[PDB]
Structure formats: C-alpha cells, structure tokens
C-alpha cells in the first residue's frame, strides 16, 4: 500500500492537512510519497485570496497561524509566493535524507507560523540546517531546482489529471496496482480518525 500526496507548499488547505501527512507517516507498512503539483509557479499585494481562508482552516483543523504570518507576511510587499523553491526543497531534502515529509511540515511552519519568506534560497537552506541537513542541502537544493524539479512538476500534473483531481490537497491510494482517491475532507482536522482508516485499509487488504 502506497499514500500518494498531491500538495503545494503554499496551499493553506494543505497545511490544513499537515495532520494527516503526519499522522499517515505513523501506519506501519505504510508507503508515503509526496507529489509537489507547482501551484504557483504571485507578489503579495494576493492577500485577499488567501486570509479569509486561512482563519476558516485554523478553526476547521486546529492548525495554527502566527501574528508573523498574519501581520508580517502577508503584509510585506516583497514578499513572492512562488511554489517552486519550497518544492525543490522538499525534494532536495528527500534525495538527500528521505526527509521530504518532515521538511514540508518544517516549509509550512515557516510561512504560516513564523511568516518566513520561503521562496528564498537562505530561508529554505536554514530550514534544511534546522533539520540536520547542512552537510549537502545548499548543492541538493541547486540540483533539485532545475531539471529535477521541472520533471517533477510535469508527473505530478500528469498524475492529478488522470484523478480528475481539481487540485491541492489530493490523497490517492495505491493497492496492487489500483489507485483510488481519498475523501480527504471528510478527514480535515480528524487525524487520528485518518490513522485508522488507513490501518482499516491495511487490515481490509
């Protein structure tokens, strides 16, 4: 059994799905891999979009946001949500220490709590410092942020088309070769519901 994760970095439903990411990494036998789909591949000026939404996943999920993010962040005209360099991020810190769903959960924080620029090359290698990787992420990253990020890209969109997902966050299920997309909203802010229902899938296999 394979939990595939379609997700962007700077998708505020995702971080309202952080849980269950977190919650998933914990169902033993349980395979995890992360699919980045380049959502925006926006300066804030942007804000508008996003805020109102934001209040509405902390009290759906508990999932917190920080006075840095809310009055810093989304206040700072030079502020660029791009999603490409947090995705390279991701996974640079997967090629690098298969710690590509420990360095999104740390990418989110980031932006949400802390209102960190994460488009930025210093902040995303300070994350990657946080996480024990110093030795190697600065040339990971450069690596990932061509090429390997721009085919990435191109099979996770390749992948959401085939679900008809409309887009972030998306969780498919892998069994023998069957992939079946999960009710994902059902299980917003109920993680350890989520646990159990991939361990009843297990169980049901």
């Given at each position: 059994l394979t939990l595939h994760y379609?997700?962007?970095?700077?998708?505020?439903?995702?971080?309202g799905a952080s849980p269950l990411l977190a919650a998933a990494c914990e169902v033993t036998g349980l395979d995890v891999r992360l699919h980045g789909g380049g959502m925006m591949t926006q300066p804030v000026g942007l804000r508008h979009y996003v805020m109102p939404h934001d209040l509405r996943i902390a009290q759906?999920?508990?999932?917190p946001f920080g006075k840095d993010y809310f009055d810093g962040l989304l206040r700072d005209t030079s502020a660029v949500f791009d999603s490409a360099p947090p995705t390279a991020a991701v996974l640079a810190a997967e090629a690098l220490d298969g710690l590509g769903a420990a360095m999104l959960a740390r990418i989110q924080r980031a932006h949400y709590v802390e209102g960190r620029r994460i488009a930025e090359r210093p902040v995303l290698l300070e994350l990657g410092a946080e996480l024990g990787l110093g030795e190697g992420f600065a040339e990971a990253f450069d690596a990932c942020s061509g090429e390997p990020l721009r085919a990435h890209f191109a099979d996770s969109r390749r992948l959401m088309n085939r679900l008809?997902?409309?887009?972030?966050?998306?969780?498919?299920l892998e069994r023998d070769g069957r992939l079946?997309?999960?009710?994902?909203?059902?299980?917003?802010?109920?993680?350890?519901?989520?646990r159990?229902?991939?361990?009843?899938?297990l169980r049901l296999a």
């Open positions: 379609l997700y962007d970095p700077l998708c505020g439903w995702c971080y759906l999920t508990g999932q008809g997902a409309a887009g972030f966050p998306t969780f498919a079946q997309v999960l009710d994902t909203g059902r299980y917003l802010g109920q993680p350890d519901d989520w159990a229902f991939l361990e009843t899938q």
